[PDB]
């Protein structure tokens, strides 16, 4: 039974509208920040911090414990992406930039070394192994009719 005035609407132009808009979404009129009016269809839906639900207090008594939400709280435009089963934005022990540099450096270094170790293989001091009957020409599917090129190995 939600009426047209209780639903999201167009961008607030006059200062009075932002007051009505903020009251509609249960926010302080000084805390209500509509999205930029660039024509991407956000209207007057509040813009909330891009913080994952995993950050919210795990000990507070939530109406919806798994979603970390309170009945009537304005939900983030991307709530379904910030649920606890998805993207997590919690602070990390190591700075984000230093994480990428270390991981990229490790992978980049390892790949180069494998290439370095590819052109310089490590093998043992032995010549090619020898097999009889012309290097197993008949065993390896050689044509019975066309007699093979003779191959001879000598005792040593």
């Amino acid at each position: 039974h939600i009426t047209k005035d209780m639903l999201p609407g167009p961008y607030p132009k006059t200062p009075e509208e932002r007051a009505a808009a903020a009251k509609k979404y249960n926010m302080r009129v000084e805390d209500y920040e509509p999205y930029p009016d660039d024509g991407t269809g956000y209207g007057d839906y509040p813009k909330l911090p891009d913080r994952s639900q995993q950050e919210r207090d795990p000990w507070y008594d939530w109406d919806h414990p798994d979603l970390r939400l309170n009945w009537g709280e304005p939900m983030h435009w991307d709530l379904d992406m910030y649920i606890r089963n998805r993207v997590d934005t919690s602070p990390t022990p190591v700075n984000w930039n230093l994480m990428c540099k270390h991981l990229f450096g490790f992978v980049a270094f390892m790949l180069f070394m494998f290439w370095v170790g590819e052109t310089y293989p490590a093998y043992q001091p032995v010549g090619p192994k020898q097999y009889p009957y012309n290097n197993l020409y008949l065993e390896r599917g050689g044509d019975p009719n066309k007699e093979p090129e003779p191959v001879v190995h000598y005792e040593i």
Binding site: V87, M99, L103
Partner: protein, 55 residues
Amino acid sequence: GFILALEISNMTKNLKYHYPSNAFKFSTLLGYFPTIMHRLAPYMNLSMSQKSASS
């Protein structure tokens, strides 16, 4: 490995403070591959789905 680990294992009892090292955190956090790829790939894919694919 046993000798190096056993002696290094024996040094935990000494009353000496710790020095947070990059190598230590690198091993502890699995090289950051989860902390990045499990926050970057889901974010990009799940943001293109809503902004571009749907809206």
